[PDB]
Amino acid sequence: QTNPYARGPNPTAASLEASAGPFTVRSFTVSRPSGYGAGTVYYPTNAGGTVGAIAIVPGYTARQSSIKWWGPRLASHGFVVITIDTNSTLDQPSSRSSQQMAALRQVASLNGTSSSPIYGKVDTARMGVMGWSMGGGGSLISAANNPSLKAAAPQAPWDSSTNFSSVTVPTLIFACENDSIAPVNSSALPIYDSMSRNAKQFLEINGGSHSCANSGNSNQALIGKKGVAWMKRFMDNDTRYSTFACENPNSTRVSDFRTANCS
């Protein structure tokens, strides 16, 4: 009769492009991180039911400030988000994946802790992974090793191997056209091309440097619209987002677009 995971009013193009969605957002610092360096948790106060969880990791030498804007933007549409700092700023993708999954593990334990702000707010069976550069490589390793994850959306990914043909998780890849650290022709695009068994999408930002999807970027309307809709459609099975998730935006800010196995 109804989707038990659907939350919030019917989405529109304007509402997905605004800086904030429908729910009020609060946040707190993790007092004693378990297996990673530091973490901030963003959550909705009034979503009307339990919601899925997303863990986000930055890149080599980077910290939480680079990916922070995703916290309030995703949480305000009905998600619990944890953004992390790694044990060392110089950790490699394999280690970054380990710490991303330890962060999801701790969010799950906080759901059962009555003193926590997110006590009872999380559906621990529905989780997803995001991250930038080496942390986006780490996100793909996480999905390849843990196929119960519901969604993946790395940005400017990099890894020592481009072969991710074992990934069965729905994966959205954000790429930046003018990336000189993890160039599209030698990382993001071969990574996308290796995935043969999943719903997938490739979205390359016109004229974008390596940090084209970080906090402060000038395409937050489009990037945020696509990120929220992808997570809504595949973590929540919410078919109100099916067109927003799979469609070609037909935008002057996208220089390359590709999708497979979506509808």
Author numbering: 2 to 264
Give the article text.
In 2016, a research group from Keio University identified a novel PET-hydrolyzing enzyme named PETase from the bacterium Ideonella sakaiensis 201-F614. One of the most important characteristics of PETase is its ability to degrade hcPET at a low temperature (30 °C); due to this property, PETase is a promising candidate for a practical method of recycling PET. For PETase, the portion circled in the structure is the active site, which is much broader than those of the other PET hydrolases; this active site may explain why PETase can accommodate a large substrate, such as PET, at moderate temperatures.
A flexible linker (GGGGSGGGGS) was employed to link the corresponding anchoring protein with PETase and HFBI separately to prevent interference from occuring between each anchoring protein and its displaying target. To explore the structural difference between wild-type PETase and linker-attached PETase, the crystal structures of those two proteins were determined at 2.0 Å and 1.5 Å, respectively. However, the industrial application of PETase faces a substantial problem, i.e., the enzymatic activity of PETase toward hcPET remains low. There was almost no surface erosion on the PETase-treated hcPET film, suggesting that the enzymatic activity of native PETase against hcPET was rather low.
